[PDB]
Write a protein that binds this ligand. Structure first.
Ligand code: NA
Ligand code: NA
Lengths: 4, 241, 241, 4
């Protein structure tokens, strides 16, 4: 999981 | 003929319309923006999903801010007279009101203005859908246990996340929002009005996803998408023969 | 029992819920804000409309920013366990993100935060509707001829106008948006899901209203409302006996 | 007609  | 109703957009033009997908994965080093692992999964899922809805899909990869503006200007100047609708999907970094080209930002307002009812006459009165997978800020949702028409009319913004918030993308599976959007379109586009499809997307993202991170700041976080409708009619992707 | 679906909010609690109407007509002279002639027509129309939907309506007139915050804090601390939903209607001046008390502004975020899923536990999982008749800026639409859930989940913002735009109020008939909202609720609340009611409101405002002004700057202008949905289910004001 |  990563954020944009 | 008999009694007539017009509560829904006419979607039986010869063509459903364009689906422009802007898939920004790799950014110029000088911007310092990270690569968006998983976005190709999103772009491939959207291409297939809208292909089956009979959209003319055009995928564009790694566009600069200049290329994004020129593409959207050029698209807005095409003759859409035989098209029912227009769809643009933006996959990139963002902040509130902004999507990033590979070398810098673009105001979403500048993109969508090209399609105003007074500026794209062949789309006047037709639904214009902007689907945005991008951050809108840096907030994190911790969750809780359980004769004329307006020029801004007929736009729909399907935002992946609430105003002010990060949006979550999984490097292997794709983004929570695009994953869920495509699944709900696959299952319900022949069954449900579009706002009801998007509401199912809201519930799927809100209930089935939670972040996992070794960093306590980013761990166990949740997301709710954000439907912004200036539409004037119901939107069904199918029509009656 | 047989197959079960849960695509819609449970609206058969003992009570439908509160409808808080904040009706700000007269502002402190020092603010320089004009009196909002016609807003009483709106407030009376909303009171009757939501009375017939079986909401417990509370009308508040000419509240300061301090009174608005204290009222919304107090309301959020009530026990809503037996209530299906919550509705707040704000009638006032505004700008983007802001509603005015009689003596100064209130951040909409501060109002709505009191009802976050983690801060109002008896409303967690229930629809929280904020209906806002107020400006969002000073733009004018010239028109064109024709286990956990997110804390931001389950809010709906029914904005009278697009982001950045003025909103129009008629001194005799009331505001375009509230006029149209009440008419559509009266006609369709026993027939249509709430997003579809609000879409009819979008079309009514967009097609049936145009400003008349001796001032060319403000003459012949149009308006489109703005539906912002973080809801996770369909919302029907009726239930099955 | 007036604006808010
Ligand atoms: Na997402
Ligand atoms: Na209005």
């Amino acid at each position: 999981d990563e954020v944009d | 003929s008999g009694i007539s109703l017009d509560n829904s957009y006419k979607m039986d033009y010869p063509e459903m319309g364009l689906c422009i997908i802007i898939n920004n994965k790799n950014f110029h080093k000088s911007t310092g923006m990270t690569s968006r692992s998983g976005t190709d999964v999103d772009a491939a899922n959207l291409r297939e999903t809208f292909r089956n809805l009979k959209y003319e899909v055009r995928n564009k990869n790694d566009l600069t801010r200049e290329e994004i503006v020129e593409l959207m200007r050029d698209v807005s100047k095409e003759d859409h007279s035989k098209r029912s609708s227009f769809v643009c999907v933006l996959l990139s970094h963002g902040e509130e009101g902004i999507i990033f080209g590979t070398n810098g930002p673009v105001d979403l307002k500048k993109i969508t203005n090209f399609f105003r009812g007074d500026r794209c006459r062949s789309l006047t009165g037709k639904p214009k859908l902007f689907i945005i997978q991008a951050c809108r800020g840096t907030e994190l949702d911790c969750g809780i246990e359980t004769h004329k028409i307006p020029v801004e009319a007929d736009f729909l913004y399907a935002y992946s996340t609430a105003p002010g918030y990060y949006s979550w993308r999984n490097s292997k599976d794709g983004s929570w929002f695009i994953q869920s959007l495509c699944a709900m379109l696959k299952q319900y586009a022949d069954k449900l009005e579009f706002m009801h499809i998007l509401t199912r997307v809201n519930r799927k993202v809100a209930t089935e996803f939670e972040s996992f991170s070794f960093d306590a700041t980013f761990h166990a976080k949740k997301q709710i998408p954000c439907i912004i409708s200036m539409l004037t009619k119901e939107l069904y992707f199918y029509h009656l023969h």
